[PDB]
Design a protein around this nucleic acid. Structure first.
Ligand SMILES: [Mg+2]
Ligand SMILES: [Mg+2]
Ligand SMILES: [Mg+2]
Ligand SMILES: [Mg+2]
Ligand SMILES: [Mg+2]
Ligand SMILES: [Mg+2]
Ligand SMILES: [Mg+2]
Ligand SMILES: [Mg+2]
Ligand SMILES: [Mg+2]
Lengths: 153, 50, 70, 107
RNA sequence: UGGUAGUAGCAAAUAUUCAAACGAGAACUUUGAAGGCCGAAGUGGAGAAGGGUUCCAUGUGAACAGCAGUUGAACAUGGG
């Protein structure tokens, strides 16, 4: 469909899209920024390390509240976490992008992620119960994820 | 209540038969705007009155 | 798979609660496709459904104490 | 070389000293599994039910201080997990845990 | 629709552990074993008022059950 920015060389580029994904936007954006400029294989093992709590995702923008971790120093940051389901979702997206590259007929081992973007999806409401007979929303924060990979040397 | 009267039981019977979903062949009509049955009743949200 | 139906049926036939009903952990596939009180009786006769013996509550200690009381 | 069987003794009292009463036995199982994974390079560790009964013989807040465990690294069966081999822990009923070396048993 | 903010919190009633099965996926389903609680004024078995298909079986896991769910008093089919 219509993406944010088209690849400069569409001949050797693959794309992936995910809409209305039940995963936190704030976690997804910051775990996407860490893997923004990574190689395809390096990103996948990074996500597995995040799932196994071996490498952390530095929280830079949505930094309020989240505590520190010893692994954050390698990123030059003081705060980080390990959102496993956020890592898993775009890990599946990376696999889907790799399949698209295989379908197009490109070299998988030369794919470097160039553009990855996370946007806010329409929130779906739920109900929570408070004191004095009050009702407040329990809104979710789903996100849209868009990714484009291009071959590099 | 297990000691239901005839009229109340008949009223509950009609409400139960009204609670069924819309068949899937209707929304293929030309002049149709019924995407779903909006007047469905659940025993835990709406108590039907009485 | 799912065995709540079989356990409830076995308890009803055995005239005891589901606490003492022992379902064979090996022939789960054989048990799972019973779904009828008539053929769980066949399973009972086969031995796949056994009621566990009542938990022991001995009064031997009580009787020994009452002997000293007397 | 890799399919081996060896038995040790585990000082549960040392490994759970200071944990809460409602957490002693579950942590004792975790420490037994952690010890097996630490001494044998295999994250896949399975604890026998008889060993589970032996650990929980007294109660959640009361466990034997020392327990004899036969630890065996075995070649994995079908349904190929990433771990090419697994480890099995078996309880060894022993009267006294005195002058007991970590002997290596043989087939 | 934002900052608050991925924050407050998800802390009333002692407590879960192990192996297997289905399953693509299991701290949460099922089985078996162990350890527990309610302790016959019960966390048991049955009624009246009240609710009205919530009862039973199969399938789904789109939405809900403030985590997740192979589970449901959820949804769809048929009975009673
Ligand atoms: Mg800030
Ligand atoms: Mg603050
Ligand atoms: Mg509240
Ligand atoms: Mg109120
Ligand atoms: Mg908090
Ligand atoms: Mg509470
Ligand atoms: Mg009852
Ligand atoms: Mg039911
Ligand atoms: Mg939930």
């Amino acid at each position: 469909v219509r993406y944010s920015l088209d690849p400069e060389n569409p001949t050797k580029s693959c794309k992936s899209r995910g809409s209305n994904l039940r995963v936190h936007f704030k976690n997804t954006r910051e775990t996407a920024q860490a893997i923004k400029g990574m190689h395809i294989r390096k990103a996948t093992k990074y996500l597995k390390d995040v799932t196994l709590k071996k490498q952390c995702v530095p929280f830079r923008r949505y930094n309020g509240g989240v505590g520190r971790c010893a692994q954050a120093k390698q990123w030059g940051w003081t705060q980080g976490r390990w959102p496993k389901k956020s890592a898993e979702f775009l890990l599946h997206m990376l696999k889907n992008a790799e399949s698209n590259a295989e379908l197009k007929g490109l070299d998988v081992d030369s794919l470097v992620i160039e553009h990855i973007q996370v946007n806010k999806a329409p929130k779906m409401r739920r109900r929570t119960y408070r004191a004095h007979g009050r009702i407040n929303p329990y809104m979710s924060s789903p996100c849209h994820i868009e990714m484009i990979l291009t071959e590099k040397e | 209540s297990s000691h239901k009267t005839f009229r109340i039981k008949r009223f509950l019977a009609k409400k139960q038969k009204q609670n069924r979903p819309i068949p899937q062949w209707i929304w293929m009509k030309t002049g149709n705007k019924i995407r779903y049955n909006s007047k469905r009743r659940h025993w835990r949200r709406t108590k039907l009155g009485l | 798979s799912m065995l709540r139906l079989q356990k409830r049926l076995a308890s009803s036939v055995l005239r005891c609660g589901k606490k003492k009903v022992w379902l064979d952990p090996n022939e789960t596939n054989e048990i799972a496709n019973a779904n009828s009180r008539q053929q769980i009786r066949k399973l009972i006769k086969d031995g796949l459904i056994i009621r566990k013996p009542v938990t022991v509550h001995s009064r031997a200690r009580c009787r020994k104490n009452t002997l000293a009381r007397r | 070389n890799e399919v081996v069987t060896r038995e040790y003794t585990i000082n549960i009292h040392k490994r759970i000293h200071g944990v809460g009463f409602k957490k002693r036995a579950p942590r004792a199982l975790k420490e037994i599994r952690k010890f097996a994974m630490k001494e044998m390079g295999t994250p896949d560790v399975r604890i026998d039910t008889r060993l589970n009964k032996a650990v929980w013989a007294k109660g959640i807040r009361n466990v034997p201080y020392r327990i004899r465990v036969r630890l065996s690294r075995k070649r994995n069966e079908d349904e190929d997990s990433p771990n090419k081999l697994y480890t099995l822990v078996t309880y060894v009923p022993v009267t006294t845990f005195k002058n007991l070396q970590t002997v290596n048993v043989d087939e």
